[PDB]
Amino acid sequence: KGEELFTGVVPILVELDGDVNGHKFSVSGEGEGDATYGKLTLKFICTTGKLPVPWPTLVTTFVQCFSRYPDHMKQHDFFKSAMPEGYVQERTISFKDDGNYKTRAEVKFEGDTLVNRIELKGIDFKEDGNILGHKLEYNYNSHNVYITADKQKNGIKANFKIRHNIEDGSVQLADHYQQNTPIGDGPVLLPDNHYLSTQSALSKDPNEKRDHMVLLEFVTAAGIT
């Protein structure tokens, strides 16, 4: 019955508590998602001051239940099936020739609002690296999130490579390993191998003086005919 909760516009709240190399920070996000069009619109604000890591590095961490699963692929939608009770989303983001982020998130409904609560821990980052040195461009490339079933843990696994554009024209690879498990005891949909075609656009709010990020994301499931 999870899919019925996403037929219209659903309010989203994102809350993150982070620690990267001892730099403690918090981010609060607000917006909405419309799964019918695989549309996600969110505005994030760093409530502790200046964000110690570049904004693009946190995009993937900051609600795949808003992905548009075409009608013929609806039996492969794990994300919506785990709702309203939700799911736990865990990741290990390995930045090539640099450190790593270990994230634990709980995505669930709090009333009629979809909430993403995250704890992020970043370790072994280089002081003058692409991350702590803030050498990443404020943009985002299109990617494919490859999903596979994890029948033993009653959830899914995902593997993908995020390419962050560096200011000098080079690329900072951020390899993602993901694990999602349902919070509830109800039946979930265990999918066949497929992918989520993601398109992300980053922008700024001209009237906002606080360190922020406005995200517009379009996600469509594909890979099954």
Side-chain angles (χ1 to χ4, degrees), residues 17 21 24 29 32 53-55 57-58 64 67 79 88 97 105 107 112 116 120 123 138 141 154 160 163 187 207:
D17 276 336
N21 276 39
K24 299 177 187 300
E32 56 184 43
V53 291
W55 284 105
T57 70
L58 305 179
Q64 298 170 310
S67 301
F79 310 108
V88 176
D97 297 338
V107 186
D112 294 319
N116 183 15
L120 181 145
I123 63 168
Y138 193 67
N141 296 297
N154 196 41
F160 56 112
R163 297 176 293 114
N207 295 125

XYZ file of all heavy atoms in Angstrom, residues 17 21 24 29 32 53-55 57-58 64 67 79 88 97 105 107 112 116 120 123 138 141 154 160 163 187 207:
231
model
N 23.167 15.645 10.880
C 24.156 15.968 11.906
C 25.432 15.330 11.361
O 25.442 14.141 11.018
C 23.792 15.370 13.270
C 22.826 16.246 14.065
O 22.762 17.474 13.826
O 22.135 15.700 14.948
N 36.326 15.005 9.892
C 37.670 15.319 10.427
C 37.652 16.217 11.681
O 38.572 17.013 11.905
C 38.564 15.943 9.334
C 39.240 14.913 8.454
O 38.661 13.884 8.094
N 40.468 15.209 8.064
N 32.368 19.644 13.155
C 30.967 19.340 13.440
C 30.034 20.334 12.766
O 30.312 21.535 12.742
C 30.719 19.305 14.951
C 31.542 18.252 15.676
C 31.312 18.296 17.176
C 32.260 17.350 17.906
N 32.104 15.930 17.480
N 16.856 20.832 5.944
C 16.307 20.950 4.605
C 14.800 20.860 4.548
O 14.185 20.155 5.346
N 9.610 19.640 -1.265
C 8.545 18.735 -1.666
C 8.953 17.794 -2.783
O 9.914 18.042 -3.512
C 7.291 19.520 -2.072
C 7.494 20.557 -3.178
C 6.238 21.357 -3.468
O 5.552 21.773 -2.509
O 5.932 21.559 -4.662
N 32.504 21.135 4.235
C 32.678 20.260 3.073
C 31.892 20.917 1.929
O 31.015 21.737 2.198
C 32.149 18.810 3.349
C 33.023 18.120 4.357
C 30.692 18.814 3.808
N 32.239 20.642 0.648
C 31.473 21.270 -0.435
C 30.051 20.714 -0.501
O 29.836 19.513 -0.279
C 32.263 20.870 -1.687
C 33.642 20.724 -1.192
C 33.425 19.973 0.086
N 29.091 21.586 -0.817
C 27.686 21.191 -0.947
C 27.407 19.991 -1.868
O 26.644 19.105 -1.471
C 26.790 22.384 -1.329
C 26.492 23.331 -0.204
C 27.034 24.570 -0.011
C 25.591 23.109 0.892
N 26.535 25.135 1.137
C 25.650 24.263 1.716
C 24.740 22.045 1.269
C 24.889 24.387 2.905
C 23.975 22.169 2.455
C 24.060 23.338 3.257
N 29.028 17.305 -2.381
C 29.403 16.039 -1.733
C 28.313 15.441 -0.851
O 28.348 14.248 -0.534
C 30.705 16.144 -0.885
O 30.483 16.937 0.288
C 31.829 16.732 -1.682
N 27.340 16.276 -0.481
C 26.237 15.859 0.380
C 24.896 15.620 -0.321
O 23.945 15.172 0.325
C 26.053 16.872 1.518
C 27.233 17.223 2.428
C 26.811 18.251 3.464
C 27.750 15.982 3.123
N 14.916 8.407 -2.194
C 14.647 7.693 -3.436
C 13.239 7.144 -3.630
O 12.927 6.562 -4.670
C 15.729 6.643 -3.670
C 17.105 7.271 -3.815
C 18.236 6.268 -3.815
O 18.322 5.408 -2.942
N 19.144 6.411 -4.770
N 11.430 8.657 -6.649
C 11.837 8.249 -7.990
C 10.589 7.841 -8.761
O 9.641 7.320 -8.172
C 12.770 7.036 -7.933
O 13.942 7.300 -7.188
N 11.509 1.251 -2.265
C 11.397 2.503 -1.530
C 10.004 2.896 -1.059
O 9.800 3.134 0.134
C 12.028 3.629 -2.335
C 13.413 3.333 -2.829
C 13.628 3.093 -4.197
C 14.510 3.318 -1.944
C 14.924 2.839 -4.693
C 15.824 3.063 -2.417
C 16.032 2.823 -3.799
N 15.862 2.164 6.577
C 17.167 2.611 7.040
C 18.047 2.620 5.784
O 18.056 1.647 5.039
C 17.768 1.640 8.108
C 19.181 2.068 8.512
C 16.881 1.603 9.336
N 41.435 8.792 -3.586
C 42.662 9.469 -3.131
C 42.409 10.454 -1.985
O 43.155 11.418 -1.794
C 43.409 10.140 -4.304
C 43.901 9.141 -5.353
O 44.051 7.937 -5.037
O 44.138 9.563 -6.503
N 20.904 6.762 7.719
C 19.691 7.549 7.616
C 18.441 6.732 7.827
O 18.427 5.534 7.566
C 19.623 8.231 6.260
N 14.511 7.046 6.811
C 13.549 7.732 5.953
C 12.174 7.153 6.246
O 11.950 5.962 6.040
C 13.908 7.549 4.447
C 12.995 8.380 3.558
C 15.368 7.920 4.188
N 1.959 13.320 7.443
C 1.894 13.311 5.979
C 3.181 13.854 5.353
O 3.264 14.036 4.138
C 0.680 14.107 5.489
C -0.644 13.461 5.875
O -0.766 12.217 5.788
O -1.565 14.209 6.261
N 13.748 12.645 6.321
C 15.044 11.994 6.136
C 15.981 12.511 7.238
O 16.463 13.644 7.171
C 15.613 12.309 4.738
C 16.940 11.593 4.444
O 17.334 10.652 5.139
N 17.637 12.054 3.409
N 26.055 11.632 9.722
C 27.200 11.497 8.819
C 28.526 11.597 9.568
O 28.737 12.528 10.348
C 27.139 12.556 7.699
C 28.219 12.626 6.599
C 27.586 13.048 5.295
C 29.345 13.587 6.955
N 35.891 10.638 7.769
C 37.238 10.449 8.319
C 38.332 10.366 7.249
O 38.044 10.122 6.075
C 37.327 9.164 9.224
C 37.049 7.885 8.417
C 36.395 9.283 10.445
C 37.392 6.592 9.155
N 30.404 23.992 -8.069
C 29.017 23.967 -7.635
C 28.095 23.537 -8.783
O 27.374 24.348 -9.371
C 28.618 25.335 -7.061
C 27.309 25.322 -6.306
C 27.181 24.623 -5.082
C 26.178 25.989 -6.818
C 25.945 24.589 -4.386
C 24.946 25.962 -6.134
C 24.841 25.265 -4.924
O 23.648 25.275 -4.258
N 26.589 16.209 -12.147
C 26.419 15.425 -13.368
C 25.288 14.411 -13.230
O 24.808 14.145 -12.123
C 27.729 14.706 -13.719
C 28.858 15.671 -14.044
O 28.782 16.429 -15.010
N 29.915 15.638 -13.240
N 16.187 -8.633 3.628
C 14.840 -8.175 3.222
C 14.854 -6.736 2.657
O 13.875 -5.996 2.759
C 13.841 -8.341 4.400
C 12.371 -8.265 3.973
O 11.971 -8.808 2.944
N 11.562 -7.589 4.783
N 27.078 2.731 -7.168
C 27.237 3.789 -8.163
C 28.454 4.658 -7.921
O 29.006 4.693 -6.816
C 25.966 4.650 -8.349
C 25.424 5.290 -7.088
C 25.482 6.687 -6.926
C 24.762 4.522 -6.109
C 24.878 7.322 -5.804
C 24.152 5.138 -4.978
C 24.210 6.545 -4.830
N 30.634 11.445 -10.005
C 31.743 12.201 -10.564
C 31.552 13.672 -10.216
O 30.632 14.320 -10.723
C 31.783 12.036 -12.085
C 32.033 10.620 -12.585
C 31.954 10.546 -14.110
N 30.606 10.791 -14.635
C 30.255 11.835 -15.387
N 31.146 12.765 -15.722
N 29.002 11.952 -15.803
N 5.389 -6.576 4.366
C 6.035 -7.009 3.118
C 6.521 -5.856 2.266
O 5.834 -4.841 2.127
C 4.914 -7.728 2.374
C 3.979 -8.093 3.407
C 3.962 -6.932 4.332
N 18.231 35.742 -2.234
C 17.884 36.475 -1.017
C 18.388 35.818 0.274
O 18.188 36.355 1.371
C 16.366 36.697 -0.959
C 15.862 37.597 -2.083
O 14.964 37.222 -2.839
N 16.450 38.787 -2.204
